Amino acid sequence: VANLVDMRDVSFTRGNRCIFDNISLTVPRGKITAIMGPSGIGKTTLLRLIGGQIAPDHGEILFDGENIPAMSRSRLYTVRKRMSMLFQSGALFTDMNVFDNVAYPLREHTQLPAPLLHSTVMMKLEAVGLRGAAKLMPSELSGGMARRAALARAIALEPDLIMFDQPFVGQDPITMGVLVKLISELNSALGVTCVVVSHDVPEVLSIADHAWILADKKIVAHGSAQALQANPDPRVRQFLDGIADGPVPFRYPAGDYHADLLP
Amino acid sequence: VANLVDMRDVSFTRGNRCIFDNISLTVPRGKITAIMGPSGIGKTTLLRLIGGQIAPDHGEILFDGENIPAMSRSRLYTVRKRMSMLFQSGALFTDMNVFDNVAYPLREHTQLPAPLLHSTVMMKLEAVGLRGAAKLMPSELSGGMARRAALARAIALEPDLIMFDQPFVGQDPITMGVLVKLISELNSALGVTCVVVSHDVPEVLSIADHAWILADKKIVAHGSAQALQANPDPRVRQFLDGIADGPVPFRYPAGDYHADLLP
Amino acid sequence: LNALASLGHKGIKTLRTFGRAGLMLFNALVGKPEFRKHAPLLVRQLYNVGVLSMLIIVVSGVFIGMVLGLQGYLVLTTYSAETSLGMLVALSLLRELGPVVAALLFAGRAGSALTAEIGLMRATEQLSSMEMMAVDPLRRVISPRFWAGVISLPLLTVIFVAVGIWGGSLVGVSWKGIDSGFFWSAMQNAVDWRMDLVNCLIKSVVFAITVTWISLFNGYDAIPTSAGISRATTRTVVHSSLAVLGLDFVLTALMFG
Amino acid sequence: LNALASLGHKGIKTLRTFGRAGLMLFNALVGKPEFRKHAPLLVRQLYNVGVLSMLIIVVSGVFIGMVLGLQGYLVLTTYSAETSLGMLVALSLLRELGPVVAALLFAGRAGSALTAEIGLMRATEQLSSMEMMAVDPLRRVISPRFWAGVISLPLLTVIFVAVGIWGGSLVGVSWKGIDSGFFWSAMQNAVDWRMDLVNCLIKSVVFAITVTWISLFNGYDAIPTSAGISRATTRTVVHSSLAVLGLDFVLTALMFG
Amino acid sequence: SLSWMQTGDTLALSGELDQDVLLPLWEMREEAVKGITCIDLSRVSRVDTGGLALLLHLIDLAKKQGNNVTLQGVNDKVYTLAKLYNLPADVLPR
Amino acid sequence: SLSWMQTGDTLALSGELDQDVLLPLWEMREEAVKGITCIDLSRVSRVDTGGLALLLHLIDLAKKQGNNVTLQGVNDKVYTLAKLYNLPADVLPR
Ligand SMILES: Nc1ncnc2c1ncn2[C@@H]1O[C@H](COP(=O)(O)OP(=O)(O)OP(=O)(O)O)[C@@H](O)[C@H]1O
Ligand SMILES: Nc1ncnc2c1ncn2[C@@H]1O[C@H](COP(=O)(O)OP(=O)(O)OP(=O)(O)O)[C@@H](O)[C@H]1O
């Protein structure tokens, strides 16, 4: 089965909020899947849950037929060589230069000859268009170049699934235009699946193939690109087209205008 | 003259960078002007410079015929009753509730009767659609409701110019759809000018009337809405349409592929 | 020399911060001595720096008196003088450890956490928006905090010496078998008022002027990003801790010279 | 009672943090005793916590010895015994103030700034990305820091007592007119090795186990936003400062009971 | 200036309406209203938010002793602020 | 496995090319190249980035003692990575 990731029926709740009731999603091979919801409820939550940081309270999660929160400590360490992530701020070790950061996990997971290791990480900086920033400390990176360097750090051990923890936020359309161009090649070339999880409708629709809109705790109205462009449901019309007031309220629940301004 | 704000020829440089050489902009009355850019090269810089936080090294800035970095301490305090700002994170005093925050500068700049003051700030929370969040501390505000509360705090002393220090970043299209609806009324009603300064092309063009694209230190290619939609200059085609590589480089300046990967 | 020019940048840089510390504080306490606004505004600040700092002083104050009453009990018995314990821990607390240790812990709790509230208030631009409100914050947000220190720490010392000397009266008198009427008796004619009792305040009130000023200055020129602010907090604790001992050695020279 | 249920949340909550402190530290020091990687990795951490903490100890160490030599000089002259100064500041430093004050300043500089580096490293998710690198950080980033403490502070105390006792030998001998050969002479037969000299280390090495553990735990469960991390720093200084005096009163009972 | 007159059954108002001129007219709240039935909006040049709220208070306590006050002469700036703060019918009818 | 053969003037290669099988073939870098002129790409099933770089090193030091090495038999996965890392002509010609 080409379905790389499949969680059956996950039931979360930290303890007071009850996020994620009856969620379900399939991620097949060769795809660029896309998850989009309100804003600030799933993003770092689901991605550490799908990675094996946070254990669920219900359901089963597949990665080519293996349950994720049932493996050993050592065995789930071994499957981490397959999948990798890319955080919203970019996770770079500050007490290094940008060469050693992108060349870090090669020294932690394989044995390589020193002139060979130096060369094969140098070309991969060209693969993100960041060869010239070769020996800079991760402070003078101006944000835009910071995400691309962690992206080259992400493709290290030939990963087959790369989680994109909101690559698109707070950036310039030239910088958003760069990141859609790079992420288009990395699924076409190398056959890498990527789970982009964000909320940026006119950019994520130019690359997705099977979106999943997580409006409420449910997974309501998921589908392909042009199918969700015509679904007249009031939730998905309000979200994708940016309607000012639909089922999501404009105002807040309050009292009447008779005792609040007339004391 | 209806030109509220006009800086003649401002020459900045903190000391090592030389930002803002030969900048010039006019802001007339009744307008919704809009300033763009590349990615962090003016935003908090120009707005504190236009407010009288940072003094220039050259030029003259007008607010109905008065030079801004030449007033007294007391006189420039008095003109602060006219203009106000709205920060990118939302500036709320944390050790209060949201009622006292929006009702703050009324207690600092005018004498009002206590039941009258309580009522007139209560209705203004309805003016931003935030009456129900009446006595909350500014921690449980979920970001989206945080900017709107500072916006109601912004319209306090009947301001005639409200500086918008990037209202649109990192938010949901429903939340972006709310903020374009509110800011449309506040120029139509009340005749308030507002200087929106951001980089979000498919949202700022739906409201602007005379944009000013600050690509480099110069103010190159400024104009109206549809005029800048057809200007075929390579800078403004790359920025507004999000071209991946134009005059702005794709890669970084580096050496040849002969000694970097062949040691 | 090429390396002596790197010191030439510092010798100018490190003196301009002293210029900023005077210039900020001088603007903080000049003009408009208003009392209608500040009197409820200041008393909320004493809940911040006085009440929350009260518990750590007393629970540490009983441990200093119990240690000095224990350790001092061996040194008197080898010199065979029981009655000297009352004129020892009263002596040692009221002139040496009272002003020095209480100011250390005050730099610990109230010294650091005050600097955090200042730099955070510039980090979210609550400071930079208050200038758009045309209210000068240095008389508005700094001077309620600055007077909240120098009023507090003398009242933090007199609670420290008292609960310190009470715990000293436990382990010597009750547990280590000394008559109660004999212990206070040597302490009665032990210390005078003119060069001992007010002298404890003189050492303590001059510490509060430094620690409150050195704390609230580091919040005012810290780098507003999240990295520079926690750097400034651990720069505040290390700089007050030299200034309390850099002053006390001077202030013990005048009183006992 | 309605208010007694608010304590029922706390009595469970405040004990689970103790469960997290043991469970984090137990995972930090078990399995793979590798030394090829850590030996250059650890020596960079001693530049962080040992070398930068060295200057504050010695410049404060001269001020304690100069004060005790000054203040002690009045108490001996009223009892007319000059020679006792050498067996006083040697006595007082090596068993009371040596372990207690040096551990306070170590909690000041190195205690706080270590906690800042931990919580910041989770705030930018350098911790949460290292799990994607499949390297367990508790043996990788915590145990280089934890051993960097307990090795350091005994070597921070022996530098403190020595430069402390040298400054005490200045103001009494040189300035306040005492023969140099007489001062060390009373100090020679003053203190033994078995219950004094190694006893200074026993008080100091058990402080380093607590302060380093209490610092690096607060970085591991702090709220990763910029507000909660500076809250955790000023929670680290106040919690170590009780634990140094909460231990010292116990550790002065066994040695001198 | 916030000069104002009566007709014996109808409150008149003149001058400008600002948030700095309205405090003496707050002091008249029971001798000001005399069973009023109409409000002129004769010589207003600018209206403010609190001056609207002062206007909103005078009509409201003109209930429960007096009439249901009619409105006239509005310069169509107040109607902009009417639907802006979405004021209901029973506090401001036209 | 990374079994490999020679023809006396042309280096052959067989088995799979991974980043875990390539280190003994790095140990042969001067007895491996013998004035080579061609490289077969005969039985490769997967190519990796470092195995491409090992391939890129063997052609490169086949200069300055030997020939200009011809290329053949590529399974058209390496050509995808060729323009991906935009490799120039003088290090990889076809
Ligand atoms: N144990 C916990 N750990 C982390 N967050 C928690 C926990 N319990 C409750 N929360 C709340 O849930 C939220 C989880 O973080 P969240 O997923 O929002 O991060 P994020 O990257 O901002 O995601 P998004 O961008 O979607 O908001 C936090 O804002 C926090 O207030
Ligand atoms: N004295 C100074 N004060 C503030 N920033 C300074 C100063 N000197 C140099 N800088 C640099 O210039 C920048 C000024 O802030 P900036 O205008 O970038 O904030 P911003 O809101 O991120 O704006 P933008 O979105 O354009 O980046 C800072 O990032 C800082 O690194």
Residue numbers in the entry:
A (entry chain E), B (entry chain B): 5 to 267
C (entry chain A), D (entry chain D): 3 to 259
E (entry chain C), F (entry chain F): 4 to 97
What does the original paper state about this entry?
MlaFEDB is assembled in a stoichiometry of 2:2:6:2 (MlaF:MlaE:MlaD:MlaB).
Image processing generated cryo-EM maps of the MlaFEQEDB complex in different conformations (EQtall and EQclose) at resolutions of 4.3 and 3.7 Å, respectively. In contrast, the ATP-binding sites in EQtall structure are more open, suggesting that the two MlaF subunits do not adopt an ATP-bound conformation with tightly dimerized NBDs. The hexametric ring of the MCE domain in MlaD is lifted, increasing the height of the entire complex (left). The MlaE, MlaF and MlaB are essentially identical to those in the structure of nucleotide-free complex. The lift-up movement of MCE domain of MlaD leads to an extension of the central hydrophobic cavity formed by MlaE and MlaD to the periplasmic side, which may facilitate the movement of phospholipids to and/or from the periplasm. The density traces of a phospholipid tail was observed in the central cavity, suggesting the EQtall is in a transit state of lipid translocation. The structure of EQtall suggests that MlaD lift-up may facilitate the transport of the phospholipids bound inside the central cavity, which may help to move the bound phospholipids upwards to reach MlaD in the periplasm.
